[PDB]
Structure formats: structure tokens, C-alpha cells
């Protein structure tokens, strides 16, 4: 039970362990400082500014596969409530990766097969 | 992650801040005192009655783009739990605006990108 | 009986024997931002409505509300009118104009014998 | 430039002589005194009430091809301006007939084929 | 179990009481004397002549919603056998109304709910 | 309220008077004596046999719009019960005509429009 | 082998070695209301059939029977014929014409050796 | 030969024995005294009003699979003529049940297979 | 002139003579004693049970064109009223054949073509 | 704000006031003692058995609009948590009506429009 | 491996035991002595004429769900070779039933599940 | 202007020399003496009987791609008039071959290209 | 269970007796000597050469319904194994006919109906 | 409220009592020790590998209705929160069965119908 | 080279080596003793009963992907004749695996590529 | 009457003589020793493995019409039983050719056309 | 990167830094029946493959095998090449050509600072 929603290209992946959740996000062309990242309960929010390709007035864009929007964001409802305060994150090479330990109440417990 | 539902034409907008939600509602031709408004948890209700164009018996309606219903309403499920008791509201020029501070358990905490 | 112009603005048009009422929805517009003129059989309504103002902390996460700031309507009525005696009031987002008909446009009875 | 418009079943025909226009209108079930008829210039208006089939509480309508609306009307733009003040009209057998003499400015004059 | 059939515009309605049947018929533009009306058992027949709009040779029909046919008729099979001989009828304002008391064998009798 | 049914091409017409029914039937190429015809109540039957074009063995049919069947028949349910015993009939030029006086219980009585 | 004209009139066309028979349905027509001529390879049939006559007491409540009073057919045959020796009989609504073939149109044997 | 017809949701079932017809009818929400039930020959009529769900002005209908109409009725033509005067009926728990003994003339008599 | 209706596969044919109707019914795999057969007026009823193919628990049905229903029936409305009391019937080889003499009132009488 | 789900025909309506929810259920032909009714939190369960129309072996069902299932049920999720212990319910005339007072935590509080 | 093929309506069913095949066949209207039945290897043939419904020249077929063909036949390839010489057969009530013991080489031998 | 017409499967080919026309025709299964062949002007006629495959009452036709018609014929309009009296024809191996010398009036003469 | 396959127009028929199989083949325009014919078990092979219409260089083919292929053949799998060595064949008039007595193992044996 | 989701063929069934949920799951080809099973709140997870059909290099798979994937899993959101720590489970014959007692807060309490 | 056929869900795979065929069958929820397994020539038969999920009358099936049939079977025709007597079989974990050594006459012998 | 089946691109041709079958197979890029080939009865098998285009890590495939699979195979059911032990085979230039003499029981014997 | 010509002949095209390999399926063709030339950026392959030879006793009863005897391909490559140092081998129905790139077509590095 997960829902993404927001504006602008931003490919997400979601990885679930027994005791945590990893979220991965593509943000090519974004500055680490331009990225806000907050969470609580079962929701994670990612906000990003990417400034546009700056062209001198000599230059023209004669071809482009690259999205224009400068404001981009995603709100992600995850399969488990998490501990925001132990959440880590790094940002290398256009890729954001967030680690979100699960709250105890959301950690599943085994059932033996007899 | 939002749900609107009820009877009547009533264009809604929803604005999220870090610590509040604003809801805006179009209600042309309604009287401030004919509006009821309550909330709790993560749900807002707006009720309204707008009386119909009153024609003398000499006059006929020869053309109307204007909805007829006299009972109108909306129930709105917001993306955060709120503090009803600090909610304020205004009604100017056919437009209702409601401010609803977020409850502390719904306020999101930062994660640092190291 | 032709409407035409830019922007969301629900009109209704009422006819009496001696006048035309025109009603218009203009939620979110300020009385002083509305221009209103007329002559012969045509009525013009122009309005500006400024956009919902957001602090830089806030985002719009959902909107059914039109964005255009310039809105107008030209309305050709089923009778010539007297502009000079035309009245108008603006309550609660609703504009109502009253437009007495010109004498030349007032219909006279025929008897069914 | 013959434009009919209004509400209600009401079949009109329109007959043009050199010096007049005849409008014929079906209004079965209407009382002569419940009919308003006015004109000016090149427009004719016909307004009528027809009260509904009267049923005692014993009776039921088990079949009907007969329109139910009580308010019925028509505005008709003619192909010539007329002299309202000389217009006549009878109402026999559910049929209204209106005679509308043409204004002089609207009476066509001949061209000789030499 | 009712069947209309015949030629020409003639909107019928049918009303049923415990002890009778009313039939209503629109016949704008028809002369009372031009209408034959007979019945037996469970069938009613209505025959009508309406003569055409008569135009002088100056005049032209430049527009018409009004049916042309001069012979019009309807045969109506009703939900009950009736007493023709006690049948009444009046014709006002383009509308024929026929009253047709039910035969005794066709009058339903109540059933008590215990 | 009519039903035809049976085998073969046989164009039927039906004429109603106040006191009779006439039925007309096309039967090209049939012999008056090869026709059976009976009635009772409100049903007429027509039976007929038409022998086929007889070709010598030198001759071939190189084109035919003409039905082939030799047995042909029709059962016709009329809108009134009849007196069989006063029924007459004629057969001229491929056309059969039958006159069938109505029984007294099927003859319709007038209603006066007051 | 072309048919053409106005009105319901089922034709059949039979060929012998030495003649053409033409058959035609004309129910409700009077022998004397039928004109019949021919030449070379063409046959014409014209007929009038008067309408079903109704007293003013009677109504037609159902009809599968064509209404046209003028009916005709022009038929181009697969051989030239001798008009002058053409015969014809009219029984029971059915017209039958016999049309001997012209000599120039009679086919001669070829032997299969 | 089995025709239903009239206004309103009202699921009928029909049951034939050798010597009677049973009609069953769903009429949830209806009052025993609000039901009229009469019959003659081979027809049964059922009439019933059901008053609408009543709401205080605090309350709103937020959802509803339940038809709204208040006047509801059924005319039923049965496969047999019956004896009205011996017809009984019960109304328990939303369900009307009607027992209609067949008339003698309508009771089928056996044929032996030899 | 005919209506069949009921449950089950059971091909009927219907034969009309001057003085009787013959009904024929396919009923393969039914037992002569399992057949009930009654009639009155213009309606015949055939009822039949056929028991299912009997399999031992060793055996499986590996292919089957043969209907499964065990209750089968037809109610037939004929083109004439009949004399039930003089009706005979035979059951050979899966085929039921019923002979139903017409009642006098339903026998057609000749009309002479002069 | 609502989800219904389960097996069987069983029209529900749902009414919301300020302080309670009313659920209404069509259940014609069910017995008050055959109805089980429980609730907790924001979910109501209705279970019901209705036994089938009872036919003697003389009798056949010749026509039926009436569902056959005998096990019927609904699980309903309401727009508010409720107080199960103060819930009442009535079963008249095939109609079940349940009253479910809202829990305090689910009651909405007013906001003033200044 | 199960192929039917031939002329005429003839509903087959096929039944397998461990040690035989049963073929069942519908042949209503057929005479025991008009049926030929032979077999070898894994094929069975069934041939049968049924003479047509016989009508006096007074009588007409007015209706008929019953196939007309007189020659009817079935070739059936079975899932097993059989012993023709021990095959039996009965013909009661329209139904042919054939019992075909399997040949030894075709009888399956068990495998134990260890 | 090459027109073929008649009944029956009979493939024709047509070959044109300077001074003749060859017609070839398939007629497998036909006896040379059952073929009639005549011509005049620009038309050739071919008539043939082929009697059907002869089956003893032991045998059955279990498959067939071979046309059944016994009467077969063709009329052929050629692109030139011919001299019937000098026409020859053989019939070998189911194939008829006809040689038809061209009439002098139909023999083309050369044009020199200068 | 029969399969044809091969190249070129060659209409086949297949006739089956109790003790043999007849195959018939159309081969207009083929020389008896140009036809090879072999068989074994349950398959028959037919090979044929037909040489093309030979045209002098004066002549043109201006129209043709006649297949061109010179090599034609069919392999036919029959419903029974046969005795090749007792197989006869004749070839008259473009038609090949082959007689193929059945092998004893393929001759079916009767089953008595008791 | 009942959501399945994940990789692989694995037919689930879900069973509710008053005081528990039973989950059943098909897992043919899987080893008891290759199955992981955990739960908390209202979610159950099932994970399982099944190794693939093993073929020697002589052998080939010539046909296969059997899915190939080796990793298979199911996340299931149930209609009730449960008590993980008392959940049991058996795995016989391809079938996993899990018993999940409901938590007290989720057990529905009865309402009396007065 | 293969035909499966029978009743029920039961995924088969088929493995061919040089000297045997392996058949694999999904049969989750079946009991080893409820499985019958025979073979001969080139055909294998698997028969199985599986009893239905057992519910107490407290419990309801609220969701189910799991087939219901209790009788399930497959008849399989293999690409080789086999030695039934040396066939083995195992049933673990819902999976049946049968090993079927090829008969000598069905074992392929090498051909050398020179 | 032929069946091919297996994995991979491998264009097959089949040539029949009176006394043999030749099979030709395209196998570009396969090594003579990587080909297995066996036969018996009326079935031929061809197995082959072709290793993939081997690219150094500087090189990329920028375009390929060439199938990728490394395992390829074909099983071929021929129209005659063969003598495996006299089968020969060749493999030149990517093309395999196999000669397979027919067994004596599959060699067809002549029929004389008398 | 354009292919064009007559006949079934699956090509693949491999690029290195310094050369282009071209592979081509030509089952049933004789090494000596293959012509192979090139220049600048274009490669041509022509081949004849003679048809499956049948004795007059034998018939082809089924064939998935193309019949055309003339087959060819013209291939325009993504670089100009050195024809003179082009090699080529033909094993097992498969033709493989190696075509070193011309100097003017060899790409040079750019550094990412």
C-alpha cells in the first residue's frame, strides 16, 4: 500500500527490509542544497529546485529531450511507519538515497510453520 | 492524498504549508450566515444554502448558465490532522477561506542530506 | 442573444415586458475592478481578478479554481435599451444589472377576438 | 431570417402575402383568456398557460402522449416589420391565427422584365 | 394491455378509474361535427377531418411545423370492456374527452389483507 | 389489430366498413376451382394451389422473377367477428375478393359529442 | 436480356430452339387494357390497372398491394423474332406471349467427331 | 400469456398449481394499510405508496441504493381466469403473497396416454 | 397463431386439419408414466421428468451433447378451442403425439366463390 | 467516504447527522431472528439468511424476478468511528434501520467565519 | 482422441469405465429395425432412417421445431480399441445405448505412488 | 464483348486467331452423345447432361468436392461473327474443343505504319 | 477421419461401402498414360500430368477459366486400410474411378439390438 | 478492505470468523523451510522460493503449463488487526494455512434488534 | 506431439529424454491416496479428488482465488509408447512426478553425419 | 501429412521419393560435431547448439538480424516409416541433408488403370 | 547504416574503436560463388546459390527454404574504411568480414574534467 504523487519527472524506487525502508530518487541537475527532505509517520516528502539550462543570446536550443520545469516534488506514502529522527540520506551523482528505519510497531514478527 | 465529495457546484482549492492547511471555496451568491463549517481530525465540512434567482411574474428567464440547486455541500479529507479549535475563516466576495493549523503529530521533521 | 469573451463567468438573462435583467458570477472580484457599459442592444462587462496569493512556504496541492486574471463578456440582448437609466448592484460575488427597454422595443398587445 | 424560440410544444406556421404576414399556432387545451399576444417591429411573442389533466384520487394515468408543461411560449422573428396596431387574431378549436399587416417600408415593389 | 393504431398526428391519453375509463385526444384544428366517435366491447374508434390551411394565390407558406394530412384516426383497445351506451364526450379547445363507464364483468373487486 | 401468416406469395388488402370487412388477395395463375376459402369467428383462411410453368423439353427457362411454390396459403385474423354464412366471394383476373358481414356483437355504436 | 420500365410486373423468359415465350404477371388488369408490340429483338408490354374502389363508408386498414395504375416493361430478347406470327393469351392475371425466332437467329448444329 | 406493467420497483414472482395461482411481491418499506389489491377475470392489480426516508435538518443522505418513488404499482395478466371472491392475501416482512383460486372453466383436465 | 413457453429441450410440431389439431413432441429418454398431459379451451400443457444418465463411480462422462435438466415442460396455445374429453395420445419411440378435436365453435365453414 | 461489500441483493442507504450515523437496509422476506448485526470502530456488519419460496410438487415457478440466494451479507465502512454499545436497531416491514451514535473523537466542531 | 462426424441431428454422449466404453444416442422417432450399428478397432458407426411426419391432405404443418432429414448417421472414433463381438445394445424410448468392452491391449494398468 | 452465361460448372477458354475462334470447354463425366453444340452469327451454345455418381444401397457418400447438377449449359458471345457450317469439334478426355472460322466481314485487314 | 492434400485443381469424391472404398477423381484434359496411381495401408496417391493448351503464334488466349498448372496431385488418407493388390481402376471421360476393397481387419461387424 | 500484491502465481483465499482470520495459499513445488511468514497489525507477508524443474542434458522440456519464476511472494492487508504472537500455520501437500486470531479492538460486538 | 484433455485445473509439464518420459503435475491440496494413476501404450491417465476448504458455520469465505471443483483429471497422449510396468511415481509437496521408460520400439537410434 | 515442432530458427525441407525420404535443414554457424541426429519409425530428431557471436570488449553490436538462441531443435513426423539403420547424412556449407530409406511396409504399390 | 538488395541474407554489424566487422548468413552458398568489394563507407556482397536438385522420381512435399538463386546486399557503414586491409573468412554458411576504419573516421577522446 504505497502512493506517489506530485509534479515533475522524478523516478522513485522503494526498497523494504525487515527493519527499514530505502527510497531512491533521481534528480539529475539538482544542487544538494536545493533539496528539502522531510518525513513523519508513514509519509516522505521530497522537494527540489532545478534551474534551467542557461543560454547566452548567441546560442539556440535546436533539440531537447530534457524536461523544463524548475519546481519538482514527490510525496510518498510508505508501507510502514518510520522513525524520522534516525533517518539518514546521501546525494551522489544526481541520485538521492534515503534510509528510514521502521518504527517498532511496524516491524513484523515471524510465524513458525509446524 | 485527497478526497472531495458532496452535492453542488463548489470549486475547491487546497494549500499546504509546513504547519497549516488553507482551503479556499467558491460560493457566489451565498450569505455568510447561510454557511456552516466544521472540522475534526483530518476532515473538513462545508455546508451552504443559496436561495434562487427571484423573478416577478412579469419576468421570464430566457437564458441561464447558472446552477439551480439551493443545497450545496462538500466534505474534504486533508493530508494532515488539524487543530479545529485554532481554525479561522473569512468570507469575502463569494470566496470562503479557511485556515487550519496542523496538529503536532502531523508536522514533518527535516532529514539532513550528508 | 449572443455571449462572447474571455474567462469563466456564468451569465443569466431575464426579460420583462419593460426591461432586461442580466446576472453574472464574478466570485473573487472587487467591486471597483469591474467596468460596465452598454448602448443600443449590447452590454459589456470587464473584470480583473487577482490570483490566489501564496507565501513561499506554501504550495498549491489541488485546485478546481480558474487562473485567468482578465475576464470579460459582450452580450447582445433581445431589445434595445436605455443605458442612462441602467442600474447595477454587486453582492456576494454576484453582479446584477437592470436595463430598461427603449420605447421602440416594447411590445404592444394584440386582442384575440 | 425566420427564428423561432421559446419553451413548450407549439407548432407554428407562417404565411407571407404581399402586404401581410399570417402566423398560425397550435394550442390545444388552452383557454382563450390564458393567451398573451404582443408584437413590435419584426417580432411576435405568444405566451400561454395550459392547466394539467385533472385526476380524482380514484383515477390513474395509465398512458399518455400528451405533454405535461403548463407554461408555454414562442418568440418569432418575421421576414418583415409590421404594424402591431392593425394586427388582428382569432382563436378557434385550439388554433390561434394572427394577421399582421406589413409596414410600408417593408412592402416590396415590382421590377419590370424588359 | 392497450394498443393504439391508425393514421396521423393525434396525441392520446388514457385514464383508468375503478369504474370507468377516460380517453383524451388532441385534435387542434378540427370541427366538432367532423369527428365520428364509436365504441364496443373493449375498443374505441376516433375519426377526424381537418381541412388544410387555405391560402389565397397572393400568399405563400414560407415555414411550417404543422402536419398536412386531412384524414386522421385512432383505434384504441382498452384495458376493460365498456358500456358504449352510457358513454359521454365533450370537445373544447381542440381537445376531445370521452368517458366510458366500465362493464360490470370488468369491474375489479377488492381482496383483504389479513 | 391484425395477423397474417402462412406459406407463399399472396399480397393481401383489408377494408373495414361499419358493418363489414372486405379482404382482397392477389392470386395470379391460380384456377377458381383450386381455391378453398373458409371462415369462422374472426378468422379467414385462404388455400390455393398453382401449377408450375410447363416447359416442353426443347425449351429452357433462361430468366424468371416468378415464384415457384405450388402450395400457397394465408390465415388472417380480422378486427371483428363475422357471419361466415352471409360471406360472398368473387375471383376475377387473378384477384380474389371476399365480403364478410360483421356479426352484430362487433358492430360499433355511436357516441354523441355534446 | 434487359428488362426496364415502371411498376410491379414479374416477367419470365423461356427459350426454345425456334422461339421465345415471355410470361408476365398482371393481376387485376383487364385484357383490353393491355397493349402489346414488338420488332426485331424487343418486346413492349403496357398496361393500366385501375385502383381498388372504396365507398366513402369504407377505409383501407392494411395493404400489401401496389397502387400504381400505369405499368410497363420493355424487354430485349436473346434473338430477333417474327412479330407478325407472334401469338398471345391472357388467363387468370397471367399474360403469355409466343414469339417465333427469325431464321437469321436460329442456331445450327455442329458435330462432335 | 403473462404481462406485467406499471410504475416502481416491485419484484413479482408467479406460481401455478392445478387449481390456483400464487402471486408473490416484494414491497419493503410499505405499510399493510397502504396497499390496495383487486382482481377480476385474469388480471390482478397491486397499488402501494411508500413514504420517503425521513431526515431531520441536521442529517444528510450521503449514499443510497434505495429507489425514491412513493407511488408504486403492478398490473398482472395471469395464465388463467380466477375467482376474486375467494382470493386471500398475507403481508409479512416486506412480502405480499396472494392466492387466487382458478375458475372452473380454466382448470385443465387430463388426457390419458394409451 | 401460436405461443410455446416453458423449461427444457422439447421440440414441438403442430398440425392443423379442418376438424382437429395434432401436437407432436420429442421426449427421448422419458418414461410414459412420467408424462402428465392436460388441456382446456385453447391451451395444452405437457409436463415430463427424465432422470439423468446413471454412472457408476468407476465411470466418467468424457463427452456429452445431451441436456441435463430433469424437469421439462411446455405450455402451448393453439389456434382453436378444443374438446379435451375426446383427446387421445400415444407415446412411441420417444415421440408423444396428441390428437385434439376442435370444438364446433372453432370449425371454419366454407365460402363459395361465384 | 464509504465502502460496501458482500454477497446478495440488499440495498443500503446511509444517513449522517452531526452526532450519529443511521444505516438503512432492505431485507424483504427475512425473519427478524435470522439477522445478525455487529459493529466496532468504523465498520458495521449485517448478516442474514432468507429461505426460499416454498413450492409443493404440484406447483411450478412460471416467472420470477426474485433473487434466489439464501445467504446474504454486507460489510460497511462508515465515515466516522461509532459507539457500538449505544447502537439501537428496528426491523419493520422488511426494513432494517440501525442508529449508531458517533464517538466523541469523530464529532466535528464548528469554525466561525469572521 | 474423440471424433464425431456425419449427417443429421443425433446428440451423442460417451462414457468410459476401466474396462469398457458406453455410447449413448438420441434417436427419437426412429424404429428399432431401422437402425444399423457396427464397430471395429476404435470406431463405431450408427445409421438410421426416420420417416417424416405424415399429413393427410386436409392437414397442414403450421409450426415445427422438428428436423426433417430422413437419413441420419454418426461415425465415432473412441479413445480405446474394443471387442465388437461382445458389444451389446438396447433401444428404449428414443434412446440407443451401446456397451463396448475394451480390448486387453487398451486397458490401462496401475502405477503405484511411492 | 465476351459474355458467358448459363448454368453449371463448366470452365471455358477462348482463343482468337486471324481467321478463327477456338472455344475450349471442360466437361468431365459427360458422354459425347449427351452434348448438344450449336452456333450462329456471334453466338455459341453448349448443352450437356451428366448423370450422377451411382451408389448401391450398401454405399454412402462420405465426402465430395464434385458438383451434383445434371443439366449444364453455356451461351457464349464471341468477338466476331463466324461460319457455323465450317465449324468443327472433337471431344477427348472430358475436354470439348470447337473450331469456328471467322466470317469474312469479321476478318481484320492490315494497316501499314509508314 | 480423412485428409486430402497436394497441388492443383482435382475434385475428389469418396464413397464407402461395408467391404470397400471408391474414390472418384476429376482429371479433365489428362492422358490415361500420364496418370500414376499407387496405394498402401490407408493412403492413396494420384499423380497427373496435363500439358497446356498449345497455341500457334497467330493465336492469342483472350479469355480463360481453365487452370494452368501441369503437375497435379493428391494424397488421400482413407477411413480404412485397404488391399492395394485387389484394387481396380478405370478412366473414362476425364474421370478416374478407383475401387479399393477393405482389409479384413478394417471390416466392421454388426451389433444386435435386443 | 482487502489488498493483495506481489510477484508470482500464488492463489490466496481468506476466511473470517468472529474471532480470527484464516489465510490459505497454494504453493505447490515449495519446501516447508523455503517459506518465510511474518505479520503485524493488519498485514501478512508470505515469501517463498521454488527451485526450477531439473533436467539432465539428455532431457528436454517439450511442453509446460508450469510457471518458471523462483521468487514468489504475497503481501496481504486483512479486514482486521491481529495478534501475530498467537498466529499458527501448517504446510501440507502444497497448501499453506495460517490462523490469525483477531485483536480485541477488532472483534465486533453485537447490536440487538428490538 | 501431444494432447491433454480432461476436467479441472492441473498444470502439466512433459519432459523427454532419450530413454524415458517424465510427467509433472500440480495437485496442491490433494491426498496421495486420492490419486489414481494408470497408463498403457502412449497414454497416461491421472485422476484425483480434492475435498473443499472446510468452513464452520461461524466462518465466511470473504475472498478466493482457489478453484472449487473436487473431481479433477487429465488424459495425456505422449510422443512415445512406454513401459507401464516399470513406471515409477512420487508425490511431494503438491507435486506428482511420473517416470515412464520408453519401450524399445520407440527409442530413436543415431545417424552419422559423414 | 506432416508435423514439425521444437525450439529455434531452422528452415526444413522435405523430399519424398518412391522408396525414400530426404530431409534438408538450414543450420548456418553450427559445427558438424555439435549436431545430434536420430530417428525411428516415422519420426526424425535434429538437435544442435550454435555458440554466439563472440565480441571483444572494445567492440559493440550496433545492428543484428541474426537470432541469438544457442539451443536449437526440431522433431519431424514424416509420411512414411523409415529404416534408421540405413539412413545417411551430410553437412556442407551450413546445410544438413539426411536420406532415410522407406521401410518395406510403407512403400506404395501400383494400381493399373484398365 | 542502410541495408538494401535482393534475397534472404541476415546481416549483423559490429563496431570497434578502430574497425567494423560485418557478419552475413549465406547457408547453401559456395565460397567461390561470393563476390565481395568495398570502398569509402560502402560494402557489397553478391552471391549465387543454386537450387535444391531433385531427381524426377522425387517431389518436394514441404519447404521453408527460399528459392531465389541470386542474392545480394549493399551496406553503408558508420565509418569510412580501408578496403585494401580488409580481410574475410567463410565458415559453415557464415561470412565474416573485417574492415579497419580509415584514420579520418577514428574518434578521439575528450576528457571530463
Residue numbers in the entry:
A (entry chain D), B (entry chain C), D (entry chain B), E (entry chain D), F (entry chain C), H (entry chain H), ...: 34 to 147
C (entry chain A), G (entry chain A), Q (entry chain A): 35 to 147
Article excerpt on this structure:
The small heat-shock protein (sHSP) class of protein chaperone is an energy-independent class of chaperone that act as holdases when combating the potential of misfolded or damaged proteins to form aggregates. sHSPs are also assembly chaperones, associating with protein polymers, such as actin, microtubules and intermediate filaments to modulate both their oligomerization and their assemblies in cells. HSP16.5 from Methanocaldococcus jannaschii (MjHSP16.5) was the first sHSP to be structurally characterized by crystallography. The protein oligomerizes into a particle containing 24 identical subunits with octahedral symmetry. The crystal structure confirmed earlier protein structure predictions regarding a central α-crystallin domain (ACD) forming a β-strand sandwich comprised eight β-strands (numbered 2–9) organized in an immunoglobulin-like fold that is flanked by the N- and C-terminal domains that dock onto hydrophobic sites on the β4/β8 edge of this β-strand sandwich at the fourfold symmetry axis of the oligomer.
In this study, we analyse the effect of deleting the IXI motif and substitute the highly conserved arginine (R107) equivalent to the disease-causing mutation in CRYAB (R120G) into MjHSP16.5. The R107G MjHSP16.5 crystallizes in the same rhombohedral space group with eight independent molecules per asymmetric unit as the WT protein. Owing to the high diffraction data quality, the mutation is unambiguously confirmed even in the initial electron density map calculated with the molecular replacement solution using the WT structure. The negative electron density on all eight independent protein chains confirms the absence of side chain atoms. Clearly, the mutation does not cause any significant change in oligomeric state and overall structure. Closer comparison between the higher resolution WT structure presented here and the R107G MjHSP16.5 shows that there are no significant changes in the main chain positions. The root-mean-square deviation of 6299 equivalent main chain atoms is only 0.45 Å—clearly within the accuracy of the crystal structure determination. However, it is noteworthy that the R107 in WT MjHSP16.5 forms hydrogen bonds to the main chain carbonyl oxygen atoms of G41 and M43, and forms electrostatic interactions with the residue E98 of the partner chain. Although the R107G substitution does not affect the overall crystal structure of the protein in the crystal environment, the loss of these two H-bonds and the inter-molecular electrostatic interaction in the R107G MjHSP16.5 variant may very well change the dynamic behaviour in solution. Each monomer has to adapt the conformation of its ACD loop to make appropriate interactions with the adjacent dimer.
